[PDB]
């Protein structure tokens, strides 16, 4: 991998969110009302979070739509992009065992280690494990 | 974050979700057995003598009831199990944990309850 | 073993069993009034009866709660109190796998070829079954 | 190998799908509205159609009914009919394991391979599939 | 008498009441596929005019339109089964019964099924 | 009833009816042996402190009820009892149960008068 | 025309037709993982520069980013995949293709993923 | 297994016993009035009673005679009827080690699970059983 | 469409043009032979009353004609037709397909003729 | 692995076979009187038809030309160039049971067990069987 | 609270504080040798062009300046380099960690920095 | 084990904190004048602060006899009363690589680690480390 610019571009400087709001920062901020569901695993003195919303097929088992927040390094943006991509249009598979180690290997060459802001892996999971459960399917998610 | 890597670092504060159960050999299910046996002896009613773990023979002096030792069964039907009125079991993986086949349940499970069992009365 | 002790003890005083029946004899009494479904079983045989209603937190997986009904013999008033207690706030897993063999460990040393004076491990299988059922899971049920 | 019989006699004339239908030709027909929604299969340039229709109690599942279509050959017929007889009254495993070798073995003469002219292993396993999504069960298709 | 439980009761009301399938061993197994061959060899007109057994083998035999032999191989899959036109595929247990990993069948109903299809013309 | 047979033989009830006792076949007599241990030393857990099952042998330790050694017995005469006072025996079947060769009597007699004169005094 | 199945007789459509995929044995899932992993990787020979497969141990050469190995793992729970965080794993069936269950998912899906995603950037 | 026939054949429809029994029902009537003490056997929920009574030459240890009464399946009286032939003429070693395999063999084929149709293993082995007690053999029967 | 080319191919017009008889893996063969021994099976008043195959020897009966063995014969001279008052006519791959050398013939192609002669007279 | 290009570029304008004709499209377009015969084989499904013409010395074996025409696909087009040139003034050999693999060497990495998008080696062995035909001698042919 | 040791049992926020390591079975150190490997071996993109992993057979090719071996040697003085550019050198443990015996210290050391100045030049 | 008595009781009324402080609670008070130096170990499982001290001869030992202040459970007093008669009389090796069974069995019950009652194990590898650092040895520190 390669500079997409990761960081520092382009006319935000750094990511998308900051663009996006407006307020900003503005430390009096609340995100309200409702909360957008799924899996929430935000980490708040890793300075980071990220929150995946799946939409699915029930019929297929097809993911029709996921969408993601990335907050933090501006590099993990790239990795969430590529893995919503490539799990829409694809079989339930796809969208489970979601590493990790590809998101390192991907950005750019792998240390071998988790960053900690290359949460998108953790917040697929919950996502559809969520939605397992919900559908009466929590003993054979586990 | 860092050292000895890369499933095993966390920050310890991404673990507000259920983590992996991991392998990373197969010896690591063992590992985790031999620790759960260990913990339940202790505390000892006298029903329960001893744990023991020689040189890859690993044996379960249970307390007077469910006797069998547990030793890993040679390649495929994995775990022994020799219960006094229900006769052998046997299990294999089904989520990373040796689940018995005659009945479904967790290995985990089955050594949690009949030890502190023989403990109360 | 040890001591219940349901002897007929302590201050119970005819029995504790007696006294939730209610109404006494009463050569008519039957089956009342609500139900939650889950297991229920009895062999009048056996003189034992024993009836399960456990609650368990559909998206979880995890027993709420399992409360008991114990009819026939004083060993089995003990056995459905400690066999409860950890099943609740435990895995699916848990609640399942409780056999005659288990409960005469609870107690002494079975007789010969299991005491058959306590139906608790039919009433559990049920419940269980009734789980299944409910959540229409039927390959792994089967 | 014995006889039906269903060799075209009689009168209807050829088949059991001319009498059914009924406006004759009549090159307008069209066949409409309700049905149950199952499993289809229909390979054209064999001259063959079949949709089996299950209907399933919905608790442990288990096949109330089934009834079929054949389209194709009167001799066809009764293969559909004896796997429809032997899978009502039993679990849904049962309803399967349908060969490949079996269709061929109710007709007599099996080259254990098929050529298009047995469709029913192939409705058999669409209908179950089907089944699945709808009773919520997306991991046992996956 | 209190004999023999699991199997033989003596209130004769566990034949209404859920009981798990199996619980030891491989033998419930072996018994059920036995017991389904006897019932199957009466009423063969022609159809199979003989079944086989052999120590550790087992044949049954349609020969008037053929099938497959049925054979266990060394453990790993158990009771591997070469069907030709479907290639072959692998039986495990998974809850007191074996149901295939694959979208779930059972190998004593296989053939319970092929016998009768032979039976019937 | 459509249930066991030979794990439930009874065409309703057998509890009045006679039958053989029935075995199958080294797995069985184990269960039973066991079976009968426990039911005899029942409602005491200071009897016997410990049981162990390994394979090929039992053990259970006792301090007072004298020594009891189960273990197997080379073919010809299999599995052997030892009573503490007269010897090492073997059993061989005669009755579909082991039948002492000194006496032409059952082992599970055997079990009944000496484990139950240690319980009592 | 009536043989092979079911690609070599068609009834002119690929719509609708039988196929038992990941069976008929160690060489088929041998040829579909290569097959997935080749297929995904061309046009770029800094993603994958090498594939050698010399005695089922399956040697993928990337100097580039992350690779490992695909071995097979002797009778009981064959193949393997180690990945680097993952760590090493056994597959058995759960669909009738090889599932780690573990993770509860295709082999075939984690091959997709780390060419696809190593093409791209 | 073929027809005798005397499955609710001939002239009596269903059984030799109806027809020359004599008080019809009557529903107060009791097997009466001597006996030689032999095996009995019964199951009186699906009504069907067995009784074979035999008849032994103390010298040589041979079976004299052995007769039968069968109640319930006209089936059931050629098992009874096939049995007592044989043994007839014949030693008392014959009339022990009845099975089962037996009773499939005869006539009736089921799986071997008993439903209460032969009761002829019981019977036998009732009478053979009391024969040895009354000759005053015990070690033999232990 | 997707796979196995050679294997299965679809530019539907395959079925009309020629393409060799076997490509892959040598088990084709098997299949095919296989095949040719099902298909013969029905429509025989008692000319097959069993096809037994002792570990992968393969009989194949004519018993009202005698019957014959056909089995693979060690490397050199490996593969074969062995049939009474013919003796051996051996057989090697010649294009994709096992013909004998010395006058083109095809020993699955015997077995179809032979039997199907008992069939007519 | 390195482009042609040829895939719709340039002027043809939109692949090979838009080039060959001309008149272009013109949806009433046919190839008469005279054809240039041999190997033929073609998917409609995968847009792409070969057409082989070998010339071959019947007497030393000896390609003295060939020439084809690739209709679609630009990756083949290179590939069947490479493979004429190479092939004449040698052995059949060489021309014989060309691969499937090698036309996608040229383009870059092979599938390594290939889908039915070079339909090329069918046809290469039809023109095998083609020539052992003409010579006259199906022996080796089977 | 409890399991599976040692720094699964605390808060930690007593991970920066000293505790003791308590590898256990002492099989987990080579894995963490491994995963030291795995990180050696990428995060790069021309050096270690492959790992080859097998079943008891480890190659590591290393780039053109040399190469090491890193596997275990039979029994005392375990994980052995021979390195023909800097001589062979013995390890063994000497406070849970390997230590060599020698000139060298930490073996972990050792194996990161010259990784890492190879990728630089 | 038994209880000593010492179970935050009584008098005091809860042990050692409520009796030595004076000023109490207050809430702002602190370590002062001076600290005890050497390890420190704080932990919210039993939202207290361990700091331990030692003052040992040294020649061939280290200081490793801690007095193992405590301010969670009463329990823990009696830990701290027999580990500083067991570290005494004995060398430094005894009190290094801590037990986990000492703190257990002394605190309730032995099983495996000390539970999370004190992180005093921490606090002691620390404190000997400590000592190591000072005597300027690192290279038998590590």
Same mark, same amino acid.
């Given at each position: 991998g390669?500079?997409?610019?990761?960081?520092?571009?382009?006319?935000?400087?750094? +990511? #998308?969110?900051?663009?996006?709001?407006?307020?900003?920062? &503005?430390?009096?901020?609340?995100?309200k009302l409702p909360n957008v569901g799924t899996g929430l695993v935000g980490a708040?003195?890793?300075?980071?979070?990220?929150?995946?919303?799946? +939409? #699915?097929?029930?019929?297929?088992?097809?993911?029709?739509? &996921?969408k993601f927040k990335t907050f933090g390094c501006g590099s993990a943006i790239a990795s969430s992009s590529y893995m919503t991509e490539l799990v829409?249009?694809?079989?339930?598979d796809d969208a489970a065992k979601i590493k990790?180690?590809?998101?390192?290997?991907?950005?750019?060459?792998?240390?071998?280690?988790?960053?900690c802001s290359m949460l998108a892996e953790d917040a697929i999971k919950a996502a559809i494990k969520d939605y397992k459960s919900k559908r009466n399917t929590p003993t054979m998610l586990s | 974050v860092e050292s000895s890597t890369d499933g095993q670092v966390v920050p310890?504060?991404?673990?507000?979700?259920?983590?992996?159960?991991?392998?990373?050999?197969a010896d690591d299910?063992?590992?985790?057995?031999?620790?759960?046996?260990?913990?339940?002896?202790?505390?000892?009613?006298?029903?329960?003598?001893?744990?023991?773990?020689?040189?890859?023979?690993?044996?379960?002096?249970?307390?007077?009831?469910?006797?069998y030792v547990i030793n890993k069964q040679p390649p495929n039907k994995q775990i022994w199990l020799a219960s006094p009125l229900s006769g052998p079991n046997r299990f294999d993986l089904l989520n990373g944990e040796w689940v018995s086949l005659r009945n479904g349940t967790k290995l985990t499970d089955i050594?949690?309850?009949?030890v502190e069992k023989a403990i109360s009365k």
């Open positions: 390669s500079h997409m610019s990761s960081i520092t571009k382009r006319l935000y400087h750094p +990511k #998308v969110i900051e663009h996006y709001t407006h307020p900003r920062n &503005v430390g009096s901020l609340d995100k708040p003195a890793c300075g980071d979070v990220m929150r995946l919303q799946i +939409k #699915v097929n029930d019929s297929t088992g097809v993911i029709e739509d &996921v829409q249009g694809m079989t339930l990790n180690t590809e998101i390192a290997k991907e950005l750019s060459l792998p240390p071998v280690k988790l960053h | 310890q504060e991404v673990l507000n979700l259920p983590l992996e159960k991991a392998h990373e050999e299910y063992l590992d985790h057995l031999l620790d759960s046996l260990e913990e339940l002896s202790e505390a000892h009613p006298d029903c329960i003598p001893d744990v023991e773990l020689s040189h890859g023979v690993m044996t379960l002096e249970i307390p007077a009831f469910g006797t050594l949690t309850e009949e």
